[PDB]
Amino acid sequence: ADGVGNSSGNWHCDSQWLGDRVITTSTRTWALPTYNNHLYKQISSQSGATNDNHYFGYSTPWGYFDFNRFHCHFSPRDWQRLINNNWGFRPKRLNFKLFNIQVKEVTQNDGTTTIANNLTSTVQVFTDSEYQLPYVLGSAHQGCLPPFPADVFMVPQYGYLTLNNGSQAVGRSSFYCLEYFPSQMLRTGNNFQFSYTFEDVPFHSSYAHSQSLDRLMNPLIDQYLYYLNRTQTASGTQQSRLLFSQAGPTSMSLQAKNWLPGPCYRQQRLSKQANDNNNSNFPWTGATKYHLNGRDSLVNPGPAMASHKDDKEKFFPMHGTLIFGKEGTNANNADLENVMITDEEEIRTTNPVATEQYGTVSNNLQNSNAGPTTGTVNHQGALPGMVWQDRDVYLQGPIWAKIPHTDGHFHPSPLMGGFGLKHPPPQIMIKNTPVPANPPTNFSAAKFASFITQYSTGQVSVEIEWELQKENSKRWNPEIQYTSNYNKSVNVDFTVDTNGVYSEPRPIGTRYLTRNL
Amino acid sequence: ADGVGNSSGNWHCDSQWLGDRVITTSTRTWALPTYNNHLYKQISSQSGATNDNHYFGYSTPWGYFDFNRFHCHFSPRDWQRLINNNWGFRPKRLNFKLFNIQVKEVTQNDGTTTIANNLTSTVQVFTDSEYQLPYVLGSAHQGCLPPFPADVFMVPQYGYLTLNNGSQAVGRSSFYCLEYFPSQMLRTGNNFQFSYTFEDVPFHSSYAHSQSLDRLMNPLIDQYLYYLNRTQTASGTQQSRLLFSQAGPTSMSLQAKNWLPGPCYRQQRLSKQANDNNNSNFPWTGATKYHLNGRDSLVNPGPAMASHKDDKEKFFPMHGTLIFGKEGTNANNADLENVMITDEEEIRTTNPVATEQYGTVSNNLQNSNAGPTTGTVNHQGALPGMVWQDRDVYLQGPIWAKIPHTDGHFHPSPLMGGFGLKHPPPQIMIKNTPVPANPPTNFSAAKFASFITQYSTGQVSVEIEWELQKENSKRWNPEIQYTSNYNKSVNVDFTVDTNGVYSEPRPIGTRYLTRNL
Amino acid sequence: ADGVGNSSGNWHCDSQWLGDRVITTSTRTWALPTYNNHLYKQISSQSGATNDNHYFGYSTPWGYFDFNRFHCHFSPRDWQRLINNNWGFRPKRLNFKLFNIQVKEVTQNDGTTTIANNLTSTVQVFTDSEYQLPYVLGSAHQGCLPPFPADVFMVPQYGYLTLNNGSQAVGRSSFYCLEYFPSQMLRTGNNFQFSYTFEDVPFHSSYAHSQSLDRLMNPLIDQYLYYLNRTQTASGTQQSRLLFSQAGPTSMSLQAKNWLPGPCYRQQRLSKQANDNNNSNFPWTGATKYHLNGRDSLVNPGPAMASHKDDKEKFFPMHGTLIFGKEGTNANNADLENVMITDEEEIRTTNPVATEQYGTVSNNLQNSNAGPTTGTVNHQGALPGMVWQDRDVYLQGPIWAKIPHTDGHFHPSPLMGGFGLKHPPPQIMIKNTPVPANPPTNFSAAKFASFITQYSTGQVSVEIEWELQKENSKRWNPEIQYTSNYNKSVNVDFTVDTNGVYSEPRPIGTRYLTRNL
Ligand SMILES: Nc1ncnc2c1ncn2[C@H]1C[C@H](O)[C@@H](COP(=O)(O)O)O1
Ligand SMILES: Nc1ncnc2c1ncn2[C@H]1C[C@H](O)[C@@H](COP(=O)(O)O)O1
Ligand SMILES: Nc1ncnc2c1ncn2[C@H]1C[C@H](O)[C@@H](COP(=O)(O)O)O1
């Protein structure tokens, strides 16, 4: 209830730190085109694609808003405060607003374009509260709010996939008409709002451990539990004998322990230094992949596993980490120097190394005649007594994902990162209401193909309230912090360049502060 | 009381199932042109048309809204729920809204068109509550709301017919000026609404019978009523004698029965297989037709009668069923493969077969000299003790019709299908108020032929509340349900194609669940 | 709550006349066997039967009680009181009881049978209130309570028919397990009861008319309406001329009249005198029949139509009347003297004669050249202004029938006779609970084929309250009454013979008293 000449909202970008919680707000400007001429179209993989790449689905005229990346809600400085001072954080509740809507009509005459306000035109917005539509958010697609507030972004088109057989469609394939959901219709002067409250979810670990999993022992004291030291006599004629000893400071690897490392599903190892890697093409052939319904699919990034062992910085697991492009990077065949490869190194203390075997097991029964042989375990599922760390969340990266609705889920934490949610923040859908062009003067029952070309722009605000977990540590010596380099440079990190382009030089994980196991 | 910049309504398309009742809402976008230059014109059949095809009437600038098809209010899934779980349904009350009106003015300069908002222009809407205008709704014309919500449709022009003699007009011919009815005038920011309540009407049968009409007997037990078994001696010299017997399980056709099949008016039989039908042109000549005021008219589809007898799927009665076109079908001379021919087969148990005689009667009085002869009854009116089923309603098909106001009506159920109503949902009329172009500067009493070319678009919502009748059956074995084929296919049924075109592959009747007679 | 040694009910057979209403009670003794070894079996027509006689269905172990014949509730004297003194009667409410149950176990050793009380054995009884089972009552099957109270009858087996194609079964065929309905289980000392209330139903006509339909005129006075007396000049050279006259006492057939006779569907005429009928076999071939779903079925007895015209007592319509056998009559090929053929003669005044045409209509358009020709109408459906009488109810004959549940019914009065009911008196089902014989001593999952042979007997009471409509007539002269012949005879009518066999010598209609139209 405003009208043409009254702004329907204000610009709120600030972040405020209450010290129990942080409330981060982001207001951005957006532009929504008219997708595929107001038409639902089915889409399917082109025949000739490999079996693994077939798909069947539907593309819709609707757009949608996704804030699911962290840097939407945090400036690099606000991110620094969080990761430096806190052991954990989780989202509590969010608030969403659309305001200052403008709908522009576009005419094209000869080689000139003309844009004019359409004051009576309408835009449609609905949030899906009941999760009745396919949920495309957690797939780490582009189209999220820009990192830098002054940027204007384009609203991505909404489309979804369903069951397929080859490129065809089985009878269970669902078709969803989004025009079948009650949606609010807005003009210039109308605004949209809703609130949301996150369900209870474990704090993310903002900490790295100060202890290895196998080192929890007291280094001074000797155990009371014996282990088998010798299966053979030490001196004289070699003879079979069983000899036992108490494990202690000198040999730690031999002691009894209460816990096991997290589950492993092994990765191939790549070398950053050129010419060290094998010469052959094996992203697909030599990879680790899961076979689902006759289709192979990479395991990416996969179960959380340390990227590299001690003193091996150069190597990284193939398809085992999140990779981010630097500004201006091609979407096809970018060089290693252009991408930013994240590192899981903090989880060494519990999780296995992604490129190394889980361990070793005995594959036979020995006797006097047959010597003991042992097999190598390259994949291990959960065993009683395992402990593990989840993959780290970055400044740019998924905040949440929707736990698929199924009978069973095991440790439902998104494998890209973030907060697994059964009821994730709803999908906000938006489209431009069709405006017909001049109808014929004699009735025809054919459907209109003739529409006025138009688009809409506006403002969007997202306010999320994040709960914090403070550092209680008694650690004497100084902890690692995330710091900016003091040395001079042509450009400042996390800042626009001479041409106005915002860029993020490096990925920033959240794990700096240290805790004990 | 809104203004230019406030939307006058919201988009509500949903359906909600309360389990006693279902409330189905449909919101669509429409475009209304300017019909025949704001002029009432009389229309009449061109001389040279056959006597049967003459007409006389009037075409009006007004448009109108018709939701009278089912699929307007039901998605194919909502239709599946209804027909599978319910023995009957009837409409209770509806609610209608027009909102977000836009009036566009169109100029044409050289080969370029230009469309701009006319903010002060008006649209006129009135509902006819008192049924004072001719009622054109129940005639199964095009122009109803589209099946699929995302489509935009064109509002059909309103015109009506009255008495004629040849192509001329008798003095009783009525002329109705719709500009003579109080109507509401709306600008952008004004909206229109009314409510309606259906009169008590019999539930439609959503069921098929589990028994034939002639099989209601107990198959185990023998009757106490005798019938005439033999008019002649069984053995020896043939002699006239009357012999009686009790009819029983062995011969059921001979038993006494309390009820008769529904009335029959016979149809010609056609074969779907090419070359089986006769070679000659007889849609008109060999048809079944009623002769009214010197004009022949087909009986279409006609009294409800079963389409075919047992084990004769290929044949169908000529002009005896509803026929729907598949998407993209020509309106002229479409092949049998393009049309969708509905089937009345469920009513075999009571109604006669449309292509078969009603029965046989005796045309003489026998004696010893004259043997009994008997005539064939090809048409039968109501006899005491008849029972019959009404024609089935489809997903696309008439919901209601207006029972003509007359002294007498017999079983006033529309012969196309649906709910006969004495006070059907009113007609909603709409037109664009004329806007003159620049008048001359010297007074002339001639009428304006000079108008600003313009059209209007907007939004329309229809909310109907349907009452349901639940299945009480004790049937042990599983009932037939309407199911989608599981096998894979290029396209999914009841879904858009690659080019964005919504299509309905087959007509869906409501009769699946079974009841006893 | 009685036990072995307490009778659970008393014998009430009396009838009592309150003069507004009559309350007739009937108590009888019954015996229920074990039908088809406790098994549901499907039953179907044997292949080789004619198309018309095919059926498909199920036979159940359950029995049932049917009182639907009149003489169950009325003695011949109570029937005489009713039909003589009353213009109409209809049922109001009934009350039903089962009591004094006895279950007997039967062993057979060599050629000797032994019957002993099983005190712990159970019988199952349920009434179907919701009409969920097939309703087999109105089909005029045997098994009703005997006419004469001292007789003991056997409870008939319950089985039902459903859709068939040939002798096979279409997927819509319903199977009903009666063991799926909550039923009361009784031992000796338990009794069963329920009450029922008939829905409002028209009084049956107990009267015959004192006037013909075409004679309602004043015989003294001449009409003011002219009719066409002469189409040709009376004298001189014959010339076309139209001459009109007022119809009056001399010619009554020519007068204008307000009403038409009831609808006719014509019957073949048979002669009771031997050798007068044609010599050939035509019960099936020369009959009147309705064709339903590719099967012919006789119309029996058919729409109510007078049996014979004035002074033609000997002839009767073929399949047009109810026929009852005299005591001791064969069920196959009984002679004309053994059967009792009912007569509809009372309805002459309105209904057409079953063996005569309805009338005559003109089949062409005359001119000077073409003389008028006219067709004969052998079948007529309802026309505005028709009046008709329903078929008469006899002392032995159907009381009611269930109006099939369908969309439309026309004058739903059973064509055998009686009271059409949408909610007829419920079906009372009964069976003997299975008692296994000694099981094997080692578990086997096969079903028991081994049962203790047993049957049950007991008492059944039916009390119906009938409402009466008194004679108001001013008729001066004495009306016909139903009287017993005074002349002496070897046996008395409606009485046992020397051998103890009750017999009914003649059918007794209810129409004696006369009313005006
Ligand atoms: N990311 C995520 N989302 C939801 N549930 C999770 C997740 N990770 C683990 N779990 C499950 C399994 C943990 O033992 C438990 C901790 O819940 P607590 O709240 O700590 O009592 O919740
Ligand atoms: N379609 C339709 N509309 C209106 N009236 C109809 C229709 N079909 C039948 N009838 C009439 C004739 C029925 O016997 C009666 C049932 O009304 P009931 O409500 O079941 O008591 O109503
Ligand atoms: N046998 C039978 N059962 C049910 N309905 C019937 C029957 N015969 C006729 N009718 C219908 C048609 C009559 O015009 C009306 C009289 O109902 P009234 O009660 O007299 O107002 O009821």
Numbering used by the authors:
A (entry chain 8), B (entry chain 3), C (entry chain Z): 217 to 733
Could you pull the original sentences from the published paper?
Adeno-associated viruses (AAV) are single-stranded DNA packaging viruses of the Parvoviridae and belong to the genus Dependoparvovirus. The virions of the AAVs are composed of non-enveloped capsids with T = 1 icosahedral symmetry and diameters of ≈260 Å. They are assembled from 60 viral proteins (VPs): VP1 (≈82 kDa), VP2 (≈73 kDa), and VP3 (≈61 kDa) in an approximate 1:1:10 ratio. In this study, the structures of the AAV7, AAV11, AAV12, and AAV13 capsids were determined by cryo-EM in an effort to complete the panel of available structures for the defined AAV serotypes.
For AAV13, the closest related AAV serotype is AAV3 based on VP1 or VP3 amino acid sequence ranging from 94 to 95% aa sequence identity, which is followed by AAV2 with 88–90%. Nonetheless, when superposed, AAV13 is structurally slightly more similar to AAV2 compared to AAV3 (Cα RMSD: 0.65 Å vs. 0.72 Å and structural identity: 96% vs. 92%). In AAV13, the only significant structural difference is observed in VR-IV, which is slightly shorter due to a single aa deletion compared to AAV2. For AAV13, a critical aa for this binding is K528, which is not present in AAV2 or AAV3. The mutation of K528 to glutamic acid results in the inability to bind HSPG. Similar to previous observations, a structural comparison of empty to the full capsids for the individual AAV serotypes showed them to be largely identical with overall Cα RMSDs ranging from ≈0.2 to 0.3 Å. However, a major difference is the observation of weakly ordered density in the interior of the capsid maps in the full structures interpreted as the packaged genome. This density extends into a pocket underneath the 3-fold symmetry axis and has been interpreted as deoxyadenosine monophosphate (dAMP), which is positioned between conserved prolines 421/632 and histidine 631 (AAV7 numbering). In the AAV serotype structures determined in this study, the histidine side chain preferred the “left” orientation in full capsids. However, in AAV12 and AAV13, weak density was also observed toward the “right” orientation.
